[model samples]
Target: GFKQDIATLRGDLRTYAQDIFLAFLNKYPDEKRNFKNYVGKSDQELKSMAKFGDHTEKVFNLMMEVADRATDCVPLASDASTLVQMKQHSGLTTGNFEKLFVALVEYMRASGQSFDSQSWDRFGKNLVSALSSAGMK
Candidate 1:
């Protein structure tokens, strides 16, 4: 079903991603401070920076991969690894990283897409557990 959904919305992936990005900033305005020096930059300017685009794109792919996988631990592990990398790269905290799920679900709803809420929550729980296991919590 995830593969099917992805196939249907393949063309609009970028647009959805953009919407998700804005949704996050809008939802947690203060979170932008996590970007450090880039906090004052325009969205266009920030997106133009390889660091922002690269990290955001990687996260999008990781979440898509989680959606592609069914009820399994793989997605949890994938998210844990990605989070670890994110934390290492920019000292991104577990508390901050978890906020992305808010944008993710909002993105799906705004895109008129159906998503498994229960499954998504389980994925989130596992992600947080993994982060705790990694001593990042």
Candidate 2:
């Protein structure tokens, strides 16, 4: 039911996006440096910044796309394009892509979201494969 759960999560992005993004940054503080606008900003300061919100939404949307397509279709054209941009410009490695999904699974667990470990692993693996195929390091 990863597809269904992912749909539910996407529907509730407004409620969880910031929390999940912040959690990822907290767990992988070095990753925060990749976001020039976010670098040096306290987490609280990020909450008030429009750019933070925009980037959070973009990241969450990509997360949803990865989950949605994990066990089925190929990654979306737009999603692959985004990944290319991230790889070329954002300094995000494939390892960071993997960590982002780990952050999502951890956030889901901590937040008591309905999800199964098997589904999470499957989705995570497929996401990493997709990113790798897109030429992410």
Candidate 3:
């Protein structure tokens, strides 16, 4: 159900990856400080950075991957590995991750992309738990 809903939004979601990420940064401007590559960059400057685009796309793709396997809400080995990498490299906390999910869902809703809210809520809960169990604080 969630997967199908995500699939329906996949095209526009992927296309707006940067916009979605910017929304998160705007909502939590402090979190923008966590990215070394993004530090001291204006939104205009960030738009031109390859690293910014790469990271934004990676985050969106990771969400898609997790949604694809949302049936059990168990983190895949690769997902855990990616989370570890994000923690070690990007200095992203579980709180930041949670906020990112909130931003994503909120953006989708605000953009008129309808989905099963209950399923998304369940997925968000499981995702946070999975991240915590994966050793992220």
Candidate 4:
């Protein structure tokens, strides 16, 4: 793992979190109905909620840890637990996860990084394993 790459990814962690949600919303506009509590909130407010609210702290932190180290336990558990909650309680699939990961890589690219397809493939495969372990297809 490149510490420099991770540090660049870590830069402005708040915006990183916010942008991830913003991109997710952009990708699946109708999916907001699944989040009853955020149904009427503005995009910026929703982004803030994703950035600083309790709801997304564990989620973002886990992703950061995993991005920093593929096998990081905290991020691994983070994926597993969140997947279980969303799938079992909210009735969603892991497809949204692929969207989030794509957004994250996009964010990294926007933050001034060259393309590294090898890292991307490894990261993608690791997340797939995480999803499968979480009872997702």
lDDT of each: 0.62, 0.73, 0.73, 0.61
Candidate achieving higher TM-score, 3 or 4: 3
Output the lDDT of residue 112, model 1.
Answer: 50
What is the per-residue lDDT of model 4 for residues 26-112, given as tens digits with 9 covering 90 to 100? 667776665777777777677556433655555676666766655422236565656566633366656666666666566555655
Q: What does candidate 2's lDDT look like per residue over 1-137, in tens digits?
A: 66777778777885578887888888898887777678877878998999888878877786777657544534554566567665335666678877777887787777665666467766666767776777677
Q: Which of the numbered candidates is closest to the native, going by highest TM-score?
A: 2
On residues 1-137, what C-alpha lDDT tens digit does candidate 3 reach at each position?
57677777577764577887888888888886777678777777887999888878877777778778656555565676677666344666578777877876777677765676567666776777877777776
Q: Candidate 1, which ten residues in sequence have the lowest lDDT sum? A: 70-79
Q: Candidate 4, which ten residues in sequence have the lowest lDDT sum? A: 68-77
How do all the candidates rank in terms of TM-score, highest first? Answer: 2, 3, 1, 4
Off by over 4 Å in 1: 1-11, 37-50, 66-82, 85-90
| Candidate 1 displacement at residue 136 in angstroms | 1.4
lDDT of 4: 0.61
Badly placed stretches (over 4 Å) of model 3 are 39-45, 72-78, 85-90
Query: Which regions of candidate 2 fall more than 4 Å away from where they truly are?
Result: 72-82, 85-90
Which pairs of residues clash in candidate 4, taking residues 3 or more apart in a chain or in different chains? Answer: none
